[PDB]
Protein backbone atom coordinates (compact mmCIF):
# COMPACT_ATOMS: atom_id res chain seq x y z
CA UNK A 1 0.00 0.00 0.00
CA UNK A 2 0.94 3.62 0.49
CA UNK A 3 4.14 4.74 2.22
CA UNK A 4 4.39 7.86 4.38
CA UNK A 5 7.67 7.68 6.28
CA UNK A 6 9.31 10.64 7.98
CA UNK A 7 11.50 11.43 4.96
CA UNK A 8 9.08 10.31 2.23
CA UNK A 9 9.30 12.38 -0.98
CA UNK A 10 12.40 14.30 0.25
CA UNK A 11 14.51 12.92 -2.63
CA UNK A 12 15.55 16.23 -4.22
CA UNK A 13 14.68 18.44 -1.24
CA UNK A 14 17.45 16.86 0.85
CA UNK A 15 19.66 16.44 -2.24
CA UNK A 16 23.03 18.09 -2.01
CA UNK A 17 23.24 21.24 -4.11
CA UNK A 18 25.50 19.73 -6.69
CA UNK A 19 29.30 20.07 -6.88
CA UNK A 20 28.95 21.12 -3.22
CA UNK A 21 28.95 17.75 -1.42
CA UNK A 22 31.30 16.89 1.41
CA UNK A 23 31.92 18.21 4.88
CA UNK A 24 30.11 21.49 5.41
CA UNK A 25 32.33 24.56 5.45
CA UNK A 26 33.10 25.91 8.88
CA UNK A 27 31.44 29.34 8.69
CA UNK A 28 28.07 27.72 9.47
CA UNK A 29 29.41 26.62 12.87
CA UNK A 30 30.95 30.04 13.49
CA UNK A 31 27.62 31.82 13.08
CA UNK A 32 26.04 32.64 16.43
CA UNK A 33 22.36 32.65 17.38
CA UNK A 34 20.56 34.45 20.19
CA UNK A 35 16.95 33.98 21.25
CA UNK A 36 14.76 36.07 18.97
CA UNK A 37 16.84 35.79 15.80
CA UNK A 38 14.82 35.13 12.64
CA UNK A 39 16.39 32.11 10.92
CA UNK A 40 15.64 30.19 7.73
CA UNK A 41 15.31 26.42 7.62
CA UNK A 42 17.01 24.43 4.88
CA UNK A 43 17.98 20.86 5.65
CA UNK A 44 21.58 19.74 5.09
CA UNK A 45 21.34 16.19 3.76
CA UNK A 46 24.82 15.36 5.06
CA UNK A 47 23.79 15.99 8.67
CA UNK A 48 21.12 13.46 9.59
CA UNK A 49 21.03 14.25 13.31
CA UNK A 50 18.82 17.17 14.31
CA UNK A 51 17.41 17.74 10.89
CA UNK A 52 14.04 19.41 10.25
CA UNK A 53 11.10 17.50 8.91
CA UNK A 54 10.41 18.20 5.24
CA UNK A 55 7.43 20.45 5.98
CA UNK A 56 9.69 23.04 7.60
CA UNK A 57 12.01 23.25 4.61
CA UNK A 58 11.78 26.69 3.06
CA UNK A 59 10.15 27.88 6.30
CA UNK A 60 11.23 30.76 8.52
CA UNK A 61 10.82 31.28 12.24
CA UNK A 62 12.27 32.67 15.45
CA UNK A 63 14.85 31.30 17.88
CA UNK A 64 13.35 30.51 21.29
CA UNK A 65 16.17 28.36 22.73
CA UNK A 66 19.93 27.98 22.28
CA UNK A 67 21.85 24.83 23.22
CA UNK A 68 25.28 23.39 22.51
CA UNK A 69 24.67 21.89 19.06
CA UNK A 70 21.25 23.27 18.31
CA UNK A 71 18.82 26.17 18.18
CA UNK A 72 15.16 25.88 19.00
CA UNK A 73 13.03 27.54 16.32
CA UNK A 74 9.38 28.55 16.65
CA UNK A 75 7.23 28.03 13.56
CA UNK A 76 3.57 28.83 12.93
CA UNK A 77 2.05 25.83 11.16
CA UNK A 78 -1.43 26.03 9.65
CA UNK A 79 -3.45 22.88 10.37
CA UNK A 80 -7.12 23.11 9.38
CA UNK A 81 -8.27 26.74 9.57
CA UNK A 82 -5.93 27.93 12.32
CA UNK A 83 -2.23 28.23 13.03
CA UNK A 84 -0.52 26.15 15.70
CA UNK A 85 2.79 26.80 17.38
CA UNK A 86 5.39 24.22 16.38
CA UNK A 87 8.74 24.08 18.18
CA UNK A 88 11.65 22.55 16.28
CA UNK A 89 14.90 21.43 17.92
CA UNK A 90 17.21 21.95 14.96
CA UNK A 91 20.93 21.49 14.42
CA UNK A 92 22.95 24.60 13.52
CA UNK A 93 23.78 23.09 10.12
CA UNK A 94 20.13 23.36 9.02
CA UNK A 95 19.73 26.97 10.22
CA UNK A 96 20.48 30.26 8.44
CA UNK A 97 20.33 33.85 9.66
CA UNK A 98 17.65 35.60 7.63
CA UNK A 99 17.85 38.67 5.42
CA UNK A 100 14.04 38.82 5.61
CA UNK A 101 14.12 41.89 7.87
CA UNK A 102 17.30 43.46 6.48
CA UNK A 103 15.52 46.16 4.48
CA UNK A 104 13.46 47.16 7.52
CA UNK A 105 16.53 47.47 9.75
CA UNK A 106 18.58 49.18 7.05
CA UNK A 107 15.57 51.44 6.48
CA UNK A 108 14.92 52.26 10.14
CA UNK A 109 18.47 53.55 10.58
CA UNK A 110 18.14 55.45 7.30
CA UNK A 111 14.77 56.83 8.42
CA UNK A 112 16.12 58.20 11.70
CA UNK A 113 19.02 59.68 9.73
CA UNK A 114 16.75 61.61 7.36
CA UNK A 115 14.67 62.51 10.43
CA UNK A 116 17.74 63.85 12.25
CA UNK A 117 18.55 65.95 9.21
CA UNK A 118 14.89 66.94 9.01
CA UNK A 119 14.50 68.43 12.46
CA UNK A 120 17.96 69.94 11.71
CA UNK A 121 16.68 72.37 9.04
CA UNK A 122 13.06 73.13 8.16
CA UNK A 123 11.07 70.03 8.95
CA UNK A 124 10.48 68.15 5.66
CA UNK A 125 10.52 64.53 6.77
CA UNK A 126 9.06 62.42 3.94
CA UNK A 127 10.19 58.94 4.99
CA UNK A 128 7.42 56.47 4.20
CA UNK A 129 7.82 54.05 1.31
CA UNK A 130 5.60 54.63 -1.66
CA UNK A 131 5.05 52.22 -4.58
CA UNK A 132 6.32 52.98 -8.08
CA UNK A 133 4.48 56.00 -9.47
CA UNK A 134 3.73 56.24 -13.20
CA UNK A 135 6.15 58.08 -15.44
CA UNK A 136 6.22 61.83 -16.00
CA UNK A 137 6.12 63.74 -19.28
CA UNK A 138 9.33 63.86 -21.29
CA UNK A 139 10.61 64.92 -24.71
CA UNK A 140 12.06 62.34 -27.10
CA UNK A 141 14.42 63.94 -29.63
CA UNK A 142 15.22 62.65 -33.12
CA UNK A 143 18.70 64.16 -33.45
CA UNK A 144 20.55 61.13 -34.79
CA UNK A 145 17.48 59.14 -33.73
CA UNK A 146 15.21 59.32 -36.81
CA UNK A 147 13.08 56.15 -36.72
CA UNK A 148 13.46 52.79 -38.44
CA UNK A 149 10.03 51.98 -39.88
CA UNK A 150 9.43 48.28 -39.24
CA UNK A 151 7.10 46.04 -41.22
CA UNK A 152 6.00 42.47 -40.44
CA UNK A 153 8.10 39.73 -42.01
CA UNK A 154 6.82 37.06 -44.44
CA UNK A 155 6.70 33.34 -43.72
CA UNK A 156 9.92 31.43 -44.43
CA UNK A 157 10.65 27.77 -43.57
CA UNK A 158 14.36 27.63 -42.48
CA UNK A 159 14.67 23.86 -41.95
Amino acid sequence: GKSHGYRSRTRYMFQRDFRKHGAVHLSTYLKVYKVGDIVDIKANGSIQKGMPHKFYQGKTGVVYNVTKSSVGVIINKMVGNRYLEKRLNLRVEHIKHSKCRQEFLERVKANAAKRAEAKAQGVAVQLKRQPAQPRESRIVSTEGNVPQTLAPVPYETFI
Binding site: A23, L26, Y29, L30, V32, Y33, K34, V66, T67, K68, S69, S70, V71, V92
Partner: peptide, 17 residues
Protein backbone atom coordinates in the same frame (compact mmCIF):
# COMPACT_ATOMS: atom_id res chain seq x y z
CA UNK B 1 42.30 18.26 8.87
CA UNK B 2 38.88 19.87 8.58
CA UNK B 3 37.24 16.92 10.32
CA UNK B 4 39.62 17.80 13.15
CA UNK B 5 39.27 21.56 12.65
CA UNK B 6 35.48 21.40 13.04
CA UNK B 7 35.67 19.70 16.43
CA UNK B 8 38.52 21.89 17.70
CA UNK B 9 37.13 25.27 16.65
CA UNK B 10 33.35 25.02 17.09
CA UNK B 11 31.96 26.35 20.36
CA UNK B 12 28.96 25.57 22.55
CA UNK B 13 26.27 27.77 21.04
CA UNK B 14 25.15 28.92 24.52
CA UNK B 15 28.42 30.85 25.03
CA UNK B 16 28.05 32.88 21.80
CA UNK B 17 31.32 34.60 21.12
Amino acid sequence: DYYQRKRLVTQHKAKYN
